[PDB]
Structure formats: structure tokens, C-alpha cells
Design a protein around this ligand. Structure first.
Ligand SMILES: O=C(Nc1ccc(C(=O)N[C@@H]2c3ccccc3CC[C@@H]2C(=O)O)cc1)NC1CC1
Length: 167
């Protein structure tokens, strides 16, 4: 049993809710919150900009030190950093950004990072301002992630569309 409340069960291991991942993280304090990161860990907009704002920019400060030491991530890759006031850890995962012309096939590799964590709170990778189809992202998620994932969907109309079209 875990403390994720009001989620709709999609499969054995994937659950979904219309909610602000910022509020969900603050409330549940999950072991892992997933950030929709870019390779430079520049948290400017969308999930990344929101999670960073909620940390009072501490996420960005930590991220800048990470990049200075290690260099950029790979598209499809990830790193584990602090969750600050939101979670124990933040898994920064880079899905392909279609608005940058990146290869959507890398979305499966991006979701494979979730399998290293037994339970996660997460957004849809490559969706929103990353430019890919959100129905597609949910499908890749369910077909790739085997660990327990709680997907918080910010946009109410998108949430309704995702539930109603889920196969
Ligand atoms: O800004 C705040 N949260 C906050 C800000 C931005 C987001 C965000 O970009 N979400 C994405 C998104 C957005 C629109 C349409 C589709 C998608 C799909 C991917 C992702 C998702 O929802 O899975 C989420 C939360 N909170 C403070 C109170 C205002």
C-alpha cells in the first residue's frame, strides 16, 4: 500500500490522475519524482520550470554543478539528483523534444530509466512542450515501464482525452 490518492488504475502497474505534479510531490513526498529534463538540465518551462520554481531555484543550482562536473546528459538518458522539498530524489529524464527535431524513437529508452525505481511520480515524457503525441507517450509508458508509476497530468482536458482513448 502507498499514499498516492485519487489515481485511476490503467494497468497492473500504471496509474493516472489529473493533478499538479508540484502539489502531488509536496503532499506525498515520494521517493522519486521524475523531471521532464533537457540534456543541459536548464529548467525553464513546463514540468522542469515548475519543479524548479517550487524548489526556489535550488534544483537549478544543483543541476548547474552536476553539468559542470559531468557534462550534458544524452537524449533518452537520466540522472538522479536531490528531490529538495518535493521528494527524496528527482530522476531527471530526457525525452526527445520534437520541437528541437529529436528522434521520437528515443522515447522508449527514456521510459526505461523508470525501471530502476520501484515507485515513481512522473509526467508524460516528450509530451506538452516537448512536442510529441501524449496518447503515444502514455502508450510507450505502459508498454515499457514495469515498476509502479503514478502519472500526474496537469491539463484537465488532456487527462479526460487520455482516459477516454486508453486501450
Ligand atoms: O506550474 C505548475 N505545475 C506544472 C507546470 C507545467 C506542467 C507541464 O508542463 N505538464 C506537461 C503538459 C502540460 C500541458 C499539456 C500537456 C502536458 C503533457 C506533459 C506534462 C504533463 O502534464 O504530464 C505541469 C505542472 N504549478 C504551479 C501552480 C502553478
Amino acid at each position: 500500500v502507498n499514499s498516492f490518492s485519487g489515481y485511476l488504475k490503467l494497468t497492473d502497474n500504471v496509474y493516472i490522475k489529473n493533478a499538479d505534479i508540484v502539489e502531488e510531490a509536496k503532499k506525498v513526498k515520494p521517493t522519486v519524482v521524475v523531471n521532464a529534463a533537457n540534456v543541459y538540465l536548464k529548467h525553464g518551462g513546463g514540468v522542469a520550470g515548475a519543479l524548479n520554481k517550487a524548489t526556489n531555484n535550488a534544483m537549478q543550482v544543483e543541476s548547474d554543478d552536476y553539468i559542470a562536473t559531468n557534462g550534458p546528459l544524452k537524449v533518452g538518458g537520466s540522472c538522479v539528483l536531490s528531490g529538495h522539498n518535493l521528494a527524496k530524489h528527482c530522476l531527471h529524464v530526457v525525452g526527445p523534444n520534437v520541437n528541437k527535431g529529436e528522434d521520437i524513437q528515443l522515447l522508449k529508452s527514456a521510459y526505461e530509466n523508470f525501471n530502476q525505481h520501484e515507485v515513481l511520480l512522473a509526467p508524460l515524457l516528450s509530451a506538452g512542450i516537448f512536442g510529441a503525441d501524449p496518447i503515444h507517450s502514455l502508450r510507450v509508458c505502459v508498454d515499457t515501464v514495469r515498476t509502479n508509476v503514478y502519472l500526474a497530468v496537469f491539463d484537465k482536458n488532456l487527462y479526460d482525452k487520455l482516459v477516454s482513448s486508453f486501450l
